[PDB]
Design a protein that fits this description.
Chains A, B: It catalyses: ATP + H2O + lipid A-core oligosaccharideSide 1 = ADP + phosphate + lipid A-core oligosaccharideSide 2. The structure is a homodimer. The first copy, chain A, is an alpha/beta fold. In chain A, 59% of the residues lie in helices and 9% in strands. Bound molecules: zinc ion (6 copies).
Chain lengths: 576, 576
């Protein structure tokens, strides 16, 4: 939980270096006014005795009665300029870093591997690009402003005190070592407590996420009591840990102030006891300047905890940015491909496991040919179909599309040549038309969109919708039925005319007649495409050119409907 | 965007009223020290002339040389006590309100209607109970601390100035009207800009949510460019709007400080010009106290924007808490029910629509009877089955369970008597056993859990898992296959032995043989339960006692397999 993680933020402050320099200049101006405001008291005291005296004798008329009031205004304006220049330009830099960090994180998500999204929950990932960035940057920005403003102020004040009387200033200098030791001890405590508070807050988020995501299960199978108890315990821990940090700071700041004022007391005793020929105004200015030291130290003490509290978020932000991305070392970029797909001795095991999902799988697909896949509820049908789009990296075997290994193709170009209907249908919260035409096919004419819907036997329900093809499907298509959502997904794939079309159980939520209207229209456009089908209903794959039956990651049988039935094996048992 | 929303927070500060009073007492102590620190300068100046003078003549020996230094220490300790009492106890109250608000929001989610979760996205809801609460409460807490501390400090200082010389203090009093006008104008700007920044931030979250949730669609159908462009535009708007608010504050604070110092300049001119018989120390103390006014006003000016920035979140937090909950005015709470379910002239239309999903539906179910439902990809099969658990409220018709309308049953008791397998399988990120036994059936012996798994034809794959029944399924069961996940859900329902069992397409992701092993075990425990089945495979419902075919929300045919086939209607066409 070191604060060194903040050093990484500097890489994003390079383009804003010039603006940051201006902020320092403004803070310098503001800091310089603080000693000036103390010095004017010297002349004011002298003026009280003799207001007719002239402030400058070598102007050369302006008496203290008018000069001292005038200087007050000028110093105030000078301080105001520094305040605006420092606060405005520093915020420019801060907001720029927020924008850069957010954009970088979002782009990283678009390139991270599927496993990352698989392991982490959506609530985890969204919090990083909406709240963590703001909190981390805000804490750092406040710290920078205080350290620059209060550090300069202290430096200027000490320099002024040293100029007036270096001997007495030594007393104030001796407190600096004491303050440093106290700051060190407090920081050690803050970091430890910050670790604890961090883990507790994460548990709170986890209980909430598990509930806002599986509300239906909680309602139906009970568990409101179980879930409420978990959240209560989690929240209690976070509050207790957070209070523990407050108590430490509530004693930390007062102690340091006491040290300063104890030292100030000593200094005043010396001035009152061992008084020289110094004028009363000289002494008043010195004491006044010393009294302007406690304020900056208090502000620094307060930020000492804020920095230690934002480190946790920075660690997570700078972890996703360092996460490894999908391997895309290929260069080949063909405009179009014939559609021939060949797999040769392909064996895969999910990363972080020891089970061989698939082993020694070989099959050749040619344009205009239909390939069907059947299995036993987990034979690896969905795993093999997710290796062609290179969603998961394969190490053994060779997957070749149009004669070139899928690895040699640039990820974007390869995925452009393949259209896939995943088993889990997912629909954005937008119009039916916008969902049917997303990304590459975006902007397609309405006529083409409607044509694809007709093929998916979707136009009928889409037309009866309240606003036609412009109706909003709702969040994840909740406003639509399960089979209706599946048909919309089929339409999206049909619109993206690609040489290879993969469909993984695209008729699971459709009846026997609606599924027929889809297979009766897919066979008329199968001549210019290579079709891969993974289905459990042994009725839409009878006309497939080649049918592959898998059993525990191995292809046990090959052939067609007639040959497979004649063999009287796994296919014969499954068909019955 | 009024700040009046914060007034609602007061309802949660009632239990912490006592601690809040102590915080005020501490802040009073701290504020009282500020004028004291200025007054000591009067005696210090007098001491410079005559340190042998006694501070108290009526003690009665302690000279200024020792008394003045001693008082400095005592004031510092007094200030320290007030600081701890104010800062610690105020934080106690603040953290308590955070805990209360979070707990209330979580419990509200457990009672909100399904439509709410349906419309709002998970990212929206999770942000309210993790970040918005912290931000809103933190902003209010900082504001309260500053207004209490700086308001008191200003009051004490003005009282001291009035005591020393009321006539001159009038000059400082005249600036108060000017400051008030400036604060009013600035707040009007802040609120308007805060509205704009709020909407922009929401758009940023929305683009992120649509991406962290549909990453697979973005990868497969392109759209990385489309999505990145959207996020960039959204982030640009937020940054620009946020900067607009910074510039206003960067001019707001310096102007107010200039007003104060201009007034201070006038006061000093008067003292220097029209000097009476007042001692130099008296005048020095007065000027010193006046110079302690600019600091508090600056801090108040800074918080003037922070409050206006947290209002947006408070509006959302206090909106969910006001959202209407599910109607649960029933009182009946039976321990067990026979399982007879009767629907009489039930007609439903989803709230906010004009389409009649279902109309004039009547059917009677008895214990030990099997009821099957068939339809045409959206006839309303899933809508009718979600009215028995009272997920959606019905207005026309009567749904009676065991002779009592489902409305008269307490929601918890009614849902305890019904076991449902939804079409969308959802699994928590925990062990297989913990998912199979969740909520009411939690703590069941391992033997019972395994028995249920055997019935769902799940033990076979569960045993072959790395850690057996203790393996973690992963987030939403990603580590498990689709059919495997469905079988786990079936097991959960089987464990929760209930009089009524509803299954909506529980074999969509299963093959013809695995589905047979489930129907061969479900028929042996169907005598003591009432089963409702909504399936598209016309092979597991042939043995159903009554089969109901729906067509656009109306039951068109009734009977059994033989009678329905003889009729040669919708069932005959669908079966083929
Ligand atoms: Zn995560
Ligand atoms: Zn989690
Ligand atoms: Zn699958
Ligand atoms: Zn929402
Ligand atoms: Zn949204
Ligand atoms: Zn349905």
């Amino acid at each position: 939980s070191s604060l060194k993680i903040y050093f990484r933020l500097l890489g994003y402050v390079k383009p804003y270096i010039g603006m940051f320099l201006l902020s320092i200049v403004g803070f310098l101006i503001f800091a310089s006014t603080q000693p000036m405001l103390a010095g004017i008291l010297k002349y004011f005291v002298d003026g009280l005795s003799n207001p007719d005296a002239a402030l400058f004798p070598n102007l050369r008329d302006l008496h203290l009665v008018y000069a001292v009031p005038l200087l007050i205004i000028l110093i105030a304006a000078w301080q105001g300029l520094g305040s605006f220049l420092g606060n405005f330009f520093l915020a420019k830099v801060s907001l720029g870093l927020v924008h850069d960090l957010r954009v970088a994180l979002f782009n990283k998500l678009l390139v991270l591997p599927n496993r990352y999204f698989d392991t982490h929950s959506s609530g985890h990932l969204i919090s990083r690009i909406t709240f963590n960035v703001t909190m981390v940057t805000g804490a750092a920005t406040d710290a920078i402003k205080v350290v620059i403003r209060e550090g300069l102020t202290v430096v200027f004040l000490f320099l002024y005190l040293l100029w007036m009387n270096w001997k007495l200033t030594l007393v104030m200098l001796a407190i600096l070592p004491v303050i440093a030791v106290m700051v060190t001890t407090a920081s050690r405590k803050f970091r430890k407590q910050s670790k604890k508070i961090q883990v507790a807050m994460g548990d709170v988020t986890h209980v909430a996420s598990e509930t806002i995501q599986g509300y239906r299960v909680v309602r139906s199978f009970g568990g409101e009591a179980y879930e409420e108890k978990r959240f209560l315990d989690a929240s209690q821990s976070n509050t207790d840990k957070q209070l523990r940090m407050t108590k430490t700071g509530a004693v930390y700041t007062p102690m340091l102030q006491l040290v300063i004022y104890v030292a100030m007391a000593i200094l005043m005793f010396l001035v009152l006891w061992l008084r020289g020929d110094a004028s009363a105004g000289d002494l008043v200015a010195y004491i006044t300047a010393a009294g302007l030291l406690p304020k900056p130290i208090r502000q620094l003490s307060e930020v000492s905890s804020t920095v230690q509290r934002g480190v946790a978020g920075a660690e997570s932000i700078f972890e996703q940015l360092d996460e490894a991305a999908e391997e895309d070392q290929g260069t080949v970029e063909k405009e179009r491909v014939s559609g021939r797909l060949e797999v040769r001795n392909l064996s895969f095991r999910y990363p972080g496991t020891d089970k061989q999902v698939l082993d020694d799988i070989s099959f050749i697909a040619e344009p205009g040919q239909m390939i069907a896949l059947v299995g036993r509820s987990g034979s690896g049908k969905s795993t093999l179909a997710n290796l062609v789009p290179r969603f998961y990296q394969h190490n053994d075997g060779k997957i070749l599309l149009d004669g070139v290994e899928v690895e040699d193709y640039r990820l974007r170009n390869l995925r452009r040549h393949i259209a896939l209907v995943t088993q889990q249908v997912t629909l954005f919260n937008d119009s039916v038309a916008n969902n049917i035409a997303y990304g590459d096919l975006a902007g397609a004419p309405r006529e083409e969109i409607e044509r694809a819907a007709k093929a998916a036997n979707a136009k009928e329900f889409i037309d009866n919708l309240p606003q036609g093809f412009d109706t909003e499907v709702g969040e994840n298509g909740v406003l639509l039925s399960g089979g209706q959502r599946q048909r919309l997904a089929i339409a999206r794939a049909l619109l993206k005319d690609a040489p290879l079309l993969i469909l993984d159980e695209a008729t699971s939520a459709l009846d026997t007649e609606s599924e027929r209207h889809i297979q009766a229209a897919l066979d008329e456009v199968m001549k210019g495409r290579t079709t891969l089908v993974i289905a459990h209903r042994l009725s839409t794959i009878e006309k497939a050119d080649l049918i592959l039956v898998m059993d525990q990651g191995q292809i046990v049988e090959r052939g067609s409907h007639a040959e497979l039935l004649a063999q009287n094996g796994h296919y014969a048992r499954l068909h019955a």
